């Protein structure tokens, strides 16, 4: 035990020394000459309402028109952003839902929560009905985030301090990502889709390879549990939000923190993080009933969304970036552009 | 003006009607969150991985959820119960040991931001076992709680069956601990409803119904601008 602890301490010291040595300068100095983004006064183009309880997840589709939103009332609504008309309202077996997903092809959707089961629903099928295709079981904790690698693979994260990759046809886990010591509460797929990143409740984030099944890198993280995570459009970086009321940016190659977004006024932790199409505008949601837009390079508050009477829960920009969506506990989903 | 948008509008109207009807049907029931330790006997108070109970009293339905499948870490998933009407918190009063853990759990529940507006209903279970332990006198509550030695019984208080003064004193000290924890940070938004119960007690449902009625009355007072 003593030898293993000494070896771990030596390895951690070596990693910290290498991390500190490889530091040319702060990101602010390099981006000092960059022109400021300017006041981003976004406007609530549309409001969707309809939901009866707190909205807990939201995910834009590839078509950029249909967005699926889950609420703890037991409903999964597939809104059409342009005409604000409901398309499919799926009742849920378990009223407690904390995650939602949309397939890239648009055929399937996924939901999960305290039931510890990743339910899958087929939208486009014969007879024109929404029915549960496959139910994924095996997690010992609450499901927090599920994403579609493809129409046949789903990557999920649970409160069992674990993540899993599933084959829909097989119904069994093909790869188990373990190593976290806290509740993994977020999971964002990389654009290459051969890698992803997961932040856990132990104030840390880990990069994972789906094929290898072993963690590639682990980051120091914030001072508190991580609530949100998002992947930079380039794919070589990712943002992270935690309850320390601060946001951070990490680079896979640098293997260290790059920029910190914080303000003395805000003392409320993050709940949802998203990156714009260009990656210049990092949108974050705060539990003090609003959202803030930050400059990725300049690290300044460009604007505020506001307009929500309760804590925001889900944030997301469309693939083409033509709009953003914010879903809160108000049961109102507001589209800003 | 084309048939596609007309069909979409009809679909939206039908879905909205169904959602409104489902919400109207669901809003009738009152939702409760059962929380307690392993030794508190949480299962038998009212008589996958999350268990549900549904009982009707006075032609009103109560649906109570208890969570056992989580991995001993409630700082994150407890936020899902932000909309429940009440948290039925059960605590083993018989065991002098581990009672500080129950007090700390009650304080953590009370001081949570997302549970601040939520009201709790306290159930001091295994009352008869505590009475038997007090009568035996082998275990002294003074050792675990040194403040009990200077605690006199309230003058206005009086037990119904005329219990032994030692039992009444111990019960009132135990209840006073929880009410002192509650009143420190209650601020008027929520108020605890302490109670004493046994495994054989049958009127727990009526107590829960009355406490929920009081909570809803307070909610209506705060909602109907009656201050």
């Amino acid at each position, epitope marked *: 035990l003593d030898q293993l602890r000494q070896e771990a301490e030596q390895l951690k010291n070596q990693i910290r020394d290498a991390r500190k040595a490889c530091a040319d300068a702060t990101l602010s100095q390099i981006t000092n000459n960059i022109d400021p983004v300017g006041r981003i006064q976004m406007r609530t183009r549309r409001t969707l309402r309809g939901h009866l309880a707190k909205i807990y997840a939201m995910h834009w589709g590839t078509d950029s028109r249909l967005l699926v939103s889950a609420s703890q009332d037991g409903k999964l609504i597939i809104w059409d952003s342009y005409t604000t008309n409901k398309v499919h309202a799926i009742p849920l077996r378990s009223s407690w839902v904390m995650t939602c997903a949309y397939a890239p092809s648009g055929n399937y959707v996924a939901c999960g929560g305290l039931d510890n089961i990743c339910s899958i629903y087929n939208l486009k099928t014969r007879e024109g009905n929404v029915r549960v295709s496959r139910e994924l079981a095996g997690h010992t904790g609450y499901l927090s985030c599920c994403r579609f690698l493809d129409d046949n693979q789903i990557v999920t994260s649970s409160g069992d301090t674990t993540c899993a990759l599933w084959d829909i046809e097989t119904g069994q886990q093909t790869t188990t990502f373990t190593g976290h010591t806290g509740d993994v509460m977020s999971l964002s797929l990389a654009p290459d889709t051969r890698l992803f990143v997961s932040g856990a409740c132990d104030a840390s984030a880990k990069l994972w390879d789906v094929r290898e099944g072993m963690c590639r890198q682990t980051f120091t993280g914030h001072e508190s549990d991580i609530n949100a995570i998002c992947f930079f459009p380039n794919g070589n970086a990712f943002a992270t939000g935690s309850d320390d009321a601060t946001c951070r940016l990490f680079d896979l190659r640098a293997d260290q923190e790059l920029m910190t977004y914080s303000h003395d006024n805000i003392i409320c*932790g993050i709940t949802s993080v998203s990156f714009s199409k260009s990656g210049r505008l990092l949108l974050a949601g705060y539990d003090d009933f609003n959202c803030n837009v930050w400059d990725a390079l300049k690290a300044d508050r460009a604007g505020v969304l506001a307009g929500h009477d309760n804590r925001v829960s889900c944030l997301g920009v469309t693939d083409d970036g033509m709009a953003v969506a914010t879903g809160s506990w108000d049961s109102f989903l507001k589209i800003w552009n | 003006v084309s048939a596609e948008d007309k069909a979409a509008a009809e679909r939206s109207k039908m879905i909205d009607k169904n959602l409104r009807e489902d919400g109207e049907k669901a809003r009738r029931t009152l939702r409760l969150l059962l929380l307690g330790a392993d030794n508190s006997g949480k299962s038998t108070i009212v008589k996958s991985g999350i268990f549900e109970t549904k009982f009707q009293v006075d032609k009103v339905n109560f649906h109570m959820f208890d969570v056992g499948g989580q991995r001993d870490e409630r700082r994150k998933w407890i936020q899902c119960f932000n909309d429940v009407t009440a948290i039925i918190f059960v605590v083993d009063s018989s065991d002098y040991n581990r009672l500080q*853990e129950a007090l700390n759990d009650f304080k953590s529940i009370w001081n949570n931001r997302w549970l601040r507006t939520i009201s709790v209903i306290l159930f001091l279970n295994k009352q008869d076992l505590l009475a038997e332990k007090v009568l035996a006198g082998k275990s002294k509550i003074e050792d675990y709680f040194p403040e009990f030695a200077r605690y006199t019984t309230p003058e206005d208080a009086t037990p119904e069956p005329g219990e032994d003064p030692r039992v009444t004193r111990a019960k009132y000290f135990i209840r006073k601990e929880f009410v002192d924890i509650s009143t420190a940070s209650g601020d008027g938004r929520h108020i605890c409803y302490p109670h004493f119960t046994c495994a054989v007690d049958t009127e727990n449902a009526r107590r829960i119904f009355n406490d929920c009625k009081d909570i809803i009355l307070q909610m209506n007072l705060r909602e109907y601008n009656l201050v």
Partner: nanobody
Amino acid sequence: QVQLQESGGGLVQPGGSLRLSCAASGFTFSNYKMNWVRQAPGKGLEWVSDISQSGASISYTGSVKGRFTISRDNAKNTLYLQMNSLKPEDTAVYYCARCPAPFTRDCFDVTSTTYAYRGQGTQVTV
């Protein structure tokens, strides 16, 4: 890495006194409420003492009341626990732990299995 390093502890004769001090690194010390946890052999984790952000509010366990003192130094990012009249039953591993969230009154999982925000602790045998 929100590291918490404890120091002190060891074999102490009954009736003795001892000071256990935990230093903190990686997080702002002042923001977080601090707690102490005991784990006796064949016993589970139990809360024993708590101190708030400013050091004004303070709470003990009834068993250890009148014999344990908790002190918090924001300047040195350290938390000390003085132990007087050490009883033979008070032999345990002490973990100096941090409240999960900053600027937060409630601390849910201070005493729980596999909690990340706590140190390795030090063993005091009496």
